[PDB]
Amino acid sequence: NHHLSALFGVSSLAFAGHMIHVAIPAARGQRVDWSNFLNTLPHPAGLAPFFTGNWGVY
Amino acid sequence: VVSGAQVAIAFVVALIAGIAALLLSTALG
Amino acid sequence: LLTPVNNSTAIRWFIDNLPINRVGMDEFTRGLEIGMAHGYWLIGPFALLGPLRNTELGLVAGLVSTIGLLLISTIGLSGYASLVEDVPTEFDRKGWSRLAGGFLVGGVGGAIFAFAILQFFPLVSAIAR
Amino acid sequence: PVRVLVDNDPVPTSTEKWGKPGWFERNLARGPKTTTWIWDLHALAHDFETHTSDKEEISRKIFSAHFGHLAVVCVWLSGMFWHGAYFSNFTAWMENPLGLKPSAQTVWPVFGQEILNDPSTVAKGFEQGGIVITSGLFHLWRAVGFTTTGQLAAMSIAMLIIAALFLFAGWFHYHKRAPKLEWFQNVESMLNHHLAGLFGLGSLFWTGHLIHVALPVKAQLDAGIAPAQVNPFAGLDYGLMGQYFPKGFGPNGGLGAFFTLNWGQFTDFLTFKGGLEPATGALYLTDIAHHHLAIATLFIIAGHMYRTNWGIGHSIKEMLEAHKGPLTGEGHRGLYEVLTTSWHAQLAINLAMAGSITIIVAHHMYAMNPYPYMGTDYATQISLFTHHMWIGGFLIVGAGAHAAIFMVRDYDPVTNQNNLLDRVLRHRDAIISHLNWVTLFLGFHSFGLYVHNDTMQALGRPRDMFADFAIPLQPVFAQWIQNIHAAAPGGATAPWVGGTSPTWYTGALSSAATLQANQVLALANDKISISPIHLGTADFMVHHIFALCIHVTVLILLKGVLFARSSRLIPDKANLGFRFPCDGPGRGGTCQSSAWDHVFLGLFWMYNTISVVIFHFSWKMQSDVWGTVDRSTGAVNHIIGNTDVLLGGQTVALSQYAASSININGWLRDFLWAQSSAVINSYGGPLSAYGLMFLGAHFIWAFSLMFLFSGRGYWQELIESIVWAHNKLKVAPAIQPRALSITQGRAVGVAHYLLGGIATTWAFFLARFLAL
Amino acid sequence: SYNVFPALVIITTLVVPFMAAAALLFIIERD
Amino acid sequence: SHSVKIYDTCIGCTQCVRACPLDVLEMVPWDGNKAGTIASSPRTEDCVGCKRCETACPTDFLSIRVYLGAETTRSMGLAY
Amino acid sequence: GSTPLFGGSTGGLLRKAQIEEKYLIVWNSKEEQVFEMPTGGAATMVAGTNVLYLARKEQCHALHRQLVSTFKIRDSKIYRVYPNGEQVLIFPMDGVPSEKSNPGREVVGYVPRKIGDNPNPVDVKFTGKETFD
Numbered sequence A: 001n002h003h004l005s006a007l008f009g010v011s012s013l014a015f016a017g018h019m020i021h022v023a024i025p026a027a028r029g030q031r032v033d034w035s036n037f038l039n040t041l042p043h044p045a046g047l048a049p050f051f052t053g054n055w056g057v058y
Numbered sequence B: 001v002v003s004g005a006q007v008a009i010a011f012v013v014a015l016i017a018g019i020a021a022l023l024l025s026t027a028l029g
Numbered sequence C: 001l002l003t004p005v006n007n008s009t010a011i012r013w014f015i016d017n018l019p020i021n022r023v024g025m026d027e028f029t030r031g032l033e034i035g036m037a038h039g040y041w042l043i044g045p046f047a048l049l050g051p052l053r054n055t056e057l058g059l060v061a062g063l064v065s066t067i068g069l070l071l072i073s074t075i076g077l078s079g080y081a082s083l084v085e086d087v088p089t090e091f092d093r094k095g096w097s098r099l100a101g102g103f104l105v106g107g108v109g110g111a112i113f114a115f116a117i118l119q120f121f122p123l124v125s126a127i128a129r
Numbered sequence D: 001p002v003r004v005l006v007d008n009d010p011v012p013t014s015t016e017k018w019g020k021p022g023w024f025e026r027n028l029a030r031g032p033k034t035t036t037w038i039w040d041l042h043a044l045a046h047d048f049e050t051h052t053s054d055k056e057e058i059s060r061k062i063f064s065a066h067f068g069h070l071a072v073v074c075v076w077l078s079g080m081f082w083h084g085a086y087f088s089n090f091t092a093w094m095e096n097p098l099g100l101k102p103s104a105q106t107v108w109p110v111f112g113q114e115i116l117n118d119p120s121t122v123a124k125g126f127e128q129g130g131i132v133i134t135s136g137l138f139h140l141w142r143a144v145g146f147t148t149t150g151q152l153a154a155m156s157i158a159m160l161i162i163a164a165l166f167l168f169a170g171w172f173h174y175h176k177r178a179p180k181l182e183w184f185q186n187v188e189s190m191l192n193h194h195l196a197g198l199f200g201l202g203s204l205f206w207t208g209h210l211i212h213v214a215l216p217v218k219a220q221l222d223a224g225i226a227p228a229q230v231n232p233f234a235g236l237d238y239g240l241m242g243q244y245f246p247k248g249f250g251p252n253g254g255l256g257a258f259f260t261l262n263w264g265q266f267t268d269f270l271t272f273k274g275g276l277e278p279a280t281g282a283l284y285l286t287d288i289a290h291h292h293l294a295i296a297t298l299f300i301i302a303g304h305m306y307r308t309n310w311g312i313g314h315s316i317k318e319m320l321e322a323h324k325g326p327l328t329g330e331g332h333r334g335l336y337e338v339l340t341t342s343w344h345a346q347l348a349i350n351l352a353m354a355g356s357i358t359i360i361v362a363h364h365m366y367a368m369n370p371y372p373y374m375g376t377d378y379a380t381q382i383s384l385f386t387h388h389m390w391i392g393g394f395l396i397v398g399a400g401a402h403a404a405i406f407m408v409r410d411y412d413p414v415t416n417q418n419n420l421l422d423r424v425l426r427h428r429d430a431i432i433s434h435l436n437w438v439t440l441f442l443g444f445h446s447f448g449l450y451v452h453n454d455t456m457q458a459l460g461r462p463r464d465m466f467a468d469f470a471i472p473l474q475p476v477f478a479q480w481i482q483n484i485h486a487a488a489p490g491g492a493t494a495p496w497v498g499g500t501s502p503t504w505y506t507g508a509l510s511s512a513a514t515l516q517a518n519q520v521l522a523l524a525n526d527k528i529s530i531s532p533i534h535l536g537t538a539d540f541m542v543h544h545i546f547a548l549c550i551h552v553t554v555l556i557l558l559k560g561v562l563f564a565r566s567s568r569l570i571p572d573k574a575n576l577g578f579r580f581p582c583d584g585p586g587r588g589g590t591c592q593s594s595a596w597d598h599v600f601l602g603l604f605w606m607y608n609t610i611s612v613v614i615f616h617f618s619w620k621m622q623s624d625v626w627g628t629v630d631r632s633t634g635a636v637n638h639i640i641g642n643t644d645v646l647l648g649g650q651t652v653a654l655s656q657y658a659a660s661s662i663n664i665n666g667w668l669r670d671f672l673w674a675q676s677s678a679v680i681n682s683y684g685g686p687l688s689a690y691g692l693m694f695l696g697a698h699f700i701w702a703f704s705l706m707f708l709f710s711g712r713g714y715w716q717e718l719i720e721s722i723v724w725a726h727n728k729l730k731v732a733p734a735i736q737p738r739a740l741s742i743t744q745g746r747a748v749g750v751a752h753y754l755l756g757g758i759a760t761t762w763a764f765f766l767a768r769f770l771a772l
Numbered sequence E: 001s002y003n004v005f006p007a008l009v010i011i012t013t014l015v016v017p018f019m020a021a022a023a024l025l026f027i028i029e030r031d
Numbered sequence F: 001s002h003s004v005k006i007y008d009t010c011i012g013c014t015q016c017v018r019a020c021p022l023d024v025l026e027m028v029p030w031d032g033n034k035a036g037t038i039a040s041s042p043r044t045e046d047c048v049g050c051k052r053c054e055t056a057c058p059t060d061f062l063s064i065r066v067y068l069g070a071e072t073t074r075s076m077g078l079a080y
Numbered sequence G: 001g002s003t004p005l006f007g008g009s010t011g012g013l014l015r016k017a018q019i020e021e022k023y024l025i026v027w028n029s030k031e032e033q034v035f036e037m038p039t040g041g042a043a044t045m046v047a048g049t050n051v052l053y054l055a056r057k058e059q060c061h062a063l064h065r066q067l068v069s070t071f072k073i074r075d076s077k078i079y080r081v082y083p084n085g086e087q088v089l090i091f092p093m094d095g096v097p098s099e100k101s102n103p104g105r106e107v108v109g110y111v112p113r114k115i116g117d118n119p120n121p122v123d124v125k126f127t128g129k130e131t132f133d
């Protein structure tokens, strides 16, 4: 239960977090690092489409 | 660049990993 | 009192196999290894921070400086060795005396060897040029 | 379980005991036979534990004595407001805080001492002038909103009422309603009330003064209204509050914004600025108000942590018993019993903290000046730093004394079995020998650098020195910390902090010599309030001197605590007490082996410590920070001004601290000899009292050495021949003259050594900075 | 006219004090 | 070892014997005082010279006297 | 008997206790109870015979003073232990305490005069004889 959910699942979820917050903006030419990632939206609508189920905005 | 201060910092971090490895390897034997 | 600093196993193995404690050594060879270790590193502060450090004879001055420091240290150790009287083999009077002789030979030798490395380290890359 | 147990009228209020001094202790109650009795009376008078074994009676005396001390402080504060009200130029200083020197002590004209009244304090209302004061009281009173001397007089009267209230409660809670012992042991209730009530509501009520008095008074003085015309109740009128603070006191109403949690309206008068206001050189008052509001919230919150009478909260005893490990035995078990049954254990902690906080106050006040225009009052800045450095050093030594008194008097082996206290005692030889080593390391590798530099300079070898112009020892860790804090306001880790102290901004410079006017904070009198403080080789060297002096002072005081009860020398030292001269000339000689004698020796090393700190502060600020700016060149002219280091001879320009403080001859010539010219030339003018105090303190210091260097057996034999001459002429007294005891002779010596040495520097500092 | 013997300074101020200290050590520590 | 001498002014109060942290001293029977006893110093090789015995002695000028003599390991109070 | 319960300290025996002399203090205890070590720290005495090795006689006599004043334990015995292994009883010597007078002791250190009748130092000049003879 722990290796599937956390060691595989959460680690993969965290990597999707790295790709969306850091690696995809770097490919766009936008430098996101520790000094600015708290104040940099990975998407302009940020987290409002996620909780309301309107997921196609992403 | 990696300045000379950062090389020295890296060897201090490596020394701490070295004593940690020393603790583990004697507890294992 | 029994502490983790007093009781670590590969710390105990290391100290037990330093040449002052290592089983099977003669006190001369004990002193020889100790001197070679100390004389090697001792030239470093003398050569790099001494008064002639910015001239071309700075290494030679640091070498003769280190030999002077080891000779005075040996006077204390050889004098200690003549006066101990206390315990058997390594703390024998002759035992400490052979250590004092080995220390000076190794010490001067360690400084000369460290001198030669610092004076001729360009040679280790001389093949490429 | 938290109740109030009080015995009613336990002690009758009568003057019968005043006819018999020394009634409280069994040796002294037999009356004087020798002069030793006279000194014994004073030394034992506040040692309440020698007077009785009843712990409850000791706790009652302490509680009542605390009210008497608070009444003394309030009388002292009442006097400060009185002398500000009636014997000061506060009215003229309020109109010109940068042009007139503050004075609140004027001198009667007999024997010619009215020479101590000086012009540059003479103004209207204060015709004769007076002594320039360096306590900073005028800057504090102006900051908290005092505009007139009639307001200071009402504050003087209020402090006398608080004093008479405090003094009455000391009579009340000793002679009328004295609490029982279990009332004092309610430390969870005491911490709840002192955190939430004293510190929490004290800060919250002070925020209310800051919001409704200090902020609108400053708003009126910044508008240009003269302080005689300033309405002090202007912060109580909501309409007049509206014009200074349009958002916080607006149509979007003030208390309406509070209860709807619309606190963003309040950013008019509550900010997060951080830095100093460029006109006053001081912190923003809206920052100070938000500070006290934020720490009031945290302190009121902190005062609900401990369990009293409603189930919830922490039990300290169960918390201490849980924090134990394998490396530390039984851990913090028994420390609850120590700290609730030993007044000395609590005093040792609370003196250690109060002394350390007072030192933090000294550092934080110069660098983050809270009071407008005080940063250009250099004699005030020097005095306040030095005063709180001395107070903090004395209290830390007292922490060492009462930790030792705890070990002699209140330590119990049954309470401390394999706990933290028991395990420290079981390796006291390991602690002290390592502390012995590190003081020797620090002393060789810090003071020896100065001696190296003295010798290299004398031998004509300046390239062999430890200096910025030679072999550098850069303090790279402190420069790194300065870089972090320079970048932090507006940067990533404090994005909405608008500034910080200007001392951090040393990025961007490699010496104080190359300082331009845009980097410094100068006021309208063109004097520098504060600047970036460059740290170089000289600051590396003097900081390891600081580390030496602190570690030796720790070594002496901790050796006194850890060996208070026993040593390999004296195995039953605890039976001799805290304060005994020796155990005789045997065992080689055991003079000064008591824990008291470590406090005696620790006072000199505290003296040595604080003397270096304040000498460092004085020279470094004069050479690297303070001075004048020129409106041409953007040039920073420090008070001292830029030595040229020869070296080649291609001259190298450094600040005088960086060029000269790296050896002892520089400290002797450029600091002590050069800056004493004010105090030794002060005669015939108004600083002549400082010249007299400078000479008189040298005398007292020298006089102390008679006591420190000699022994009482000489003096007792000398008294014998003198008592013979009084015996011969029927003038011998019944109270037989004795030489001072061995311990008292040490105490007299260290008191006069400290008094003479500290007052010398006081006269030196104040004559230096009030003359230039 | 600068008449010094540097080797006499080295011998009399460095060498024979260290040797006198060694000699004095043998005197005070023997037996 | 220090010399601990007892003079004939001893009143046999035993206060020096109780004061001594090394058990150097003891009371033997005597006839020179009303107590019938006098301090004695049989074990002065343990005497450290602390003079606690002299401090406890009540007679004007004292009946017990410690003379600091040759120093030993015992008399210097060394645990090493 | 056995050692008191003590976790060890740095204030105990040194190489003198291996090469010159150490000291042994023996006492009986009726109750297991906590006492302060003269070395520094707290130990617990067993309910039985207690033996403790100490560096000096003064440390042994200090513990005996603590055992009398605090715990009413009277019967403490102190031995001097030599490095070959010999024990010599040194306290109490004759079984009777030192403060109580005992017929059978010899008077040692007695000078049959008051202290102000000692001879002058000029009288004993050029001899090892002292004025306290």
Ligand code: CLA
Residues within 6 Å of the ligand: D042, D043, D044, D045, D046, D047, D048, D351, D394, D395, D396, D397, D398, D399, D401, D402, D405, D578, D579, D596, D599, D600, D751, D755
């Ligand atoms: C909150 C602070 C505080 C409190 C309540 C105490 C309380 C106590 N201390 Mg502690 N102590 C403190 C801080 C404190 N101390 C500090 C800061 C130090 C370092 C200096 C000490 C160091 C210390 C020692 C070494 C000793 C004590 C002792 C005591 C106890 C008895 C005091 C007494 O009766 O002496 C009587 C007081 C006097 C006779 C007056 C003192 C006068 C001083 C020495 C000189 C004043 C000169 C002045 C500064 C300048 C005047 C010059 C001018 C007139 C020309 C009492 C428990 C004693 C004790 O045995 O505890 C059980 C003891 O031996 N304290």
Ligand SMILES: CC1=C(/C=C/C(C)=C/C=C/C(C)=C/C=C/C=C(C)/C=C/C=C(C)/C=C/C2=C(C)CCCC2(C)C)C(C)(C)CCC1
Residues within 6 Å of the ligand: C034, C073, C074, C075, C076, C077, C079, C080, C103, E021, E022, E024, E025, E028
């Ligand atoms: C192991 C080792 C070591 C060690 C060594 C040692 C052990 C040493 C010793 C040392 C010593 C052993 C020293 C000695 C010294 C001595 C001296 C320093 C002396 C002095 C003297 C004096 C000062 C004199 C005085 C006097 C007298 C006595 C009498 C007459 C008069 C007079 C005054 C002259 C080393 C480091 C090498 C390293 C390796 C290993």
Ligand SMILES: CC1=C(/C=C/C(C)=C/C=C/C(C)=C/C=C/C=C(C)/C=C/C=C(C)/C=C/C2=C(C)CCCC2(C)C)C(C)(C)CCC1
Residues within 6 Å of the ligand: C036, C037, C038, C040, C041, C105, C106, C107, C108, C109, C110, C112, C113
């Ligand atoms: C890091 C580390 C470490 C180390 C440290 C150290 C401190 C080291 C040092 C080292 C050293 C310090 C080294 C040295 C070396 C030396 C040598 C290598 C020498 C040689 C010499 C020689 C070869 C000589 C010869 C001679 C001559 C010349 C002449 C006479 C004779 C003779 C033979 C003597 C350890 C392991 C602990 C651990 C891990 C980590």
Ligand SMILES: CC(C)=CCC/C(C)=C\CC/C(C)=C\CC/C(C)=C/CC1=C(C)C(=O)c2ccccc2C1=O
Residues within 6 Å of the ligand: D706, D707, D708, D710, D711, D712, D715, D716, D738, D739, D740, D741, D742, D744, D745, D746
């Ligand atoms: C209101 C007022 C002030 C009235 C006057 C009060 C009346 C009547 C007499 C005043 C006596 C006073 C105040 C002091 C004399 C103290 C004294 C016997 C000093 C000699 C002495 C010296 C010089 C040391 O170095 C020394 C060192 C170590 C141990 C002991 C000593 C020692 O004992």
Ligand code: SF4
Residues within 6 Å of the ligand: D581, D582, D583, D584, D585, D586, D589, D590, D591, D592, D711, D742
């Ligand atoms: S000199 Fe003074 S302090 Fe030292 S042992 Fe003798 S009486 Fe005690």
Ligand code: SF4
Residues within 6 Å of the ligand: D586, F004, F019, F020, F021, F022, F023, F024, F025, F046, F047, F048, F049, F050, F051, F052, F053, F054, F066
């Ligand atoms: S000097 Fe000390 S050890 Fe010697 S007999 Fe007197 S009290 Fe005992």
